[PDB]
Design an enzyme around this catalytic site. Structure first.
Site, PDB file in Angstrom:
ATOM      1  CD  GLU A 169      -0.948   5.601  -1.220  1.00 42.98           C
ATOM      2  OE1 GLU A 169      -1.348   6.800  -1.233  1.00 42.98           O
ATOM      3  OE2 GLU A 169      -1.174   4.801  -2.170  1.00 42.98           O
ATOM      4  CD  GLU A 286      -3.414   2.260  -4.184  1.00 37.16           C
ATOM      5  OE1 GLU A 286      -3.148   3.215  -4.945  1.00 37.16           O
ATOM      6  OE2 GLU A 286      -4.106   2.377  -3.132  1.00 37.16           O
TER       7      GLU A 286
END
Ligand SMILES: OC[C@@H]1[C@@H](O[C@@H]2O[C@H](CO)[C@@H](O)[C@H](O)[C@@H]2O)[C@H](O)[C@H](O)c2nccn21
Ligand code: NA
Ligand code: NA
Length: 367
Positions: A169, A286
């Protein structure tokens, strides 16, 4: 036809990648973080999972998390004991499951956690004053990985393959390795060093490297450009991943459910097209709906949009985040159901689908 960046990967690691490449067209492996360590209402049992309590089957993919290992802690940042984690990894692998590992690294400059945004990447990369720290940190993983090895009767060492998913991320601004806290070029140097150190200097042969930007910070009008912010190059990545909680009902997303479903499909379509162009494998590394408040979440918000488009469907796996233990973590947080939770029957349907594979119906992935 996809080839690993480790040209000398172990037989089992090569076989996993090849078998994922084959099964992705018709199937999707389901994953869960910390699935054997604890659940919402239990902790301590040496062989239990919320996922198995609902469906009768373990997840196909087991996610684990190393944050704190680098500090020499006995347990990770969520109090998962590292010795028990090694045994749980070995147990899942022994049943034919897949292992993936993330690493919410503590901030070396301040001693805070990954969400402490004190700048550090510039110091950690080659030439930086804390480059010795980066080496010491990575050495703790090398040691952890040794605790996963077995030695056969002929004296040969074997390891579980690991899908290693570091520095995730990075297009977000929430972690100290993120946009605004590290330059793009420094991020790339950090990633490239991580691969050179583990693959080339330390000679780990049981890793598959996964890259995982966050969807919420990619412009859907310019997806590829946004996805490739900080991309370190094809010689450094095996799995073209994506963390997408946004299009599956995130509380801050004002888009309609129908717009969200379309965006999930479009994000995964474009992810798969990137992977295809690069000779890699894509995955939804995710996702989830925290506290499973959306009716029929599994079939209507995940499986339906994935299966709607034959490109989107070519992702290899989907992983949801952990089922935090209520007795010790005061904030209710969970992404898979437990018995009696409102989405449990819909999760049974997700399991039952011919497309979705849990541990119980995996082919032999390591031959
Ligand atoms: O916000 C959900 C999830 C993040 O979850 C956190 O994970 C850490 C590490 O396990 C844990 O200490 C926290 O309590 C919390 O569960 C996690 O950062 C994950 O990568 C992610 N990405 C978007 C949302 N999450
Ligand atoms: Na698939
Ligand atoms: Na199934």
């Amino acid at each position: 036809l996809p080839a690993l960046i480790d040209t000398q990967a172990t037989a089992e690691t090569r076989a996993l990648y090849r078998n994922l490449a084959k099964l992705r067209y018709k199937h999707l492996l389901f994953g869960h973080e910390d699935s054997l360590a604890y659940g919402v209402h239990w902790e301590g049992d040496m062989d239990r999972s919320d996922v198995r309590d609902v469906t009768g089957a373990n997840p196909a993919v087991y996610g684990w998390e190393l944050g704190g290992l680098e500090l020499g802690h006995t347990a990770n940042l969520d109090a998962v004991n590292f010795e028990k984690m090694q045994h749980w990894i070995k147990a899942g692998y022994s049943r034919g499951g897949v292992i993936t590992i993330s690493w919410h690294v503590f901030n070396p400059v301040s001693g805070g956690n990954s969400w402490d945004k004190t700048p550090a990447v510039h110091e950690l990369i080659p030439g930086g004053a804390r480059h010795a720290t980066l080496k010491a940190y990575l050495d703790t993983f090398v040691a952890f990985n040794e605790g996963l090895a077995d030695v056969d009767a002929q004296g040969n060492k074997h390891y579980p393959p690991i899908i290693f998913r570091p520095w995730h991320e990075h297009n977000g601004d929430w972690f100290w390795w993120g946009k605004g806290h590290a330059s793009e070029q420094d991020y790339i140097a950090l990633w490239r060093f991580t691969v050179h150190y583990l693959r080339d200097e330390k000679k780990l042969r049981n890793l598959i490297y996964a890259y995982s930007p966050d969807r919420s910070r990619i412009d859907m009008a310019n997806f590829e450009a946004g996805y490739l912010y900080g991309y370190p190059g094809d010689a450094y990545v095996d799995i073209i991943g994506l963390d997408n909680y946004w299009d599956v009902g995130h509380e801050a997303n004002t888009a309609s459910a129908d717009e969200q479903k379309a965006a999930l499909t479009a994000s995964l379509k474009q992810l798969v097209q990137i992977a295809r162009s690069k000779g890699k494998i894509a995955a939804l590394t995710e996702t989830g709906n925290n506290r499973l408040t959306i009716d029929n979440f599994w079939t209507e918000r995940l499986l339906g949009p994935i299966s709607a488009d034959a490109d989107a469907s070519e992702i290899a796996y989907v992983m949801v985040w952990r089922n935090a233990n209520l007795a010790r973590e005061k904030s209710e947080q969970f992404f898979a159901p437990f018995p009696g939770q409102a989405t449990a029957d819909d999760f049974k349907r997700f399991y039952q689908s011919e497309v979705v594979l849990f541990e119980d119906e995996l082919p032999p992935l390591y031959r």
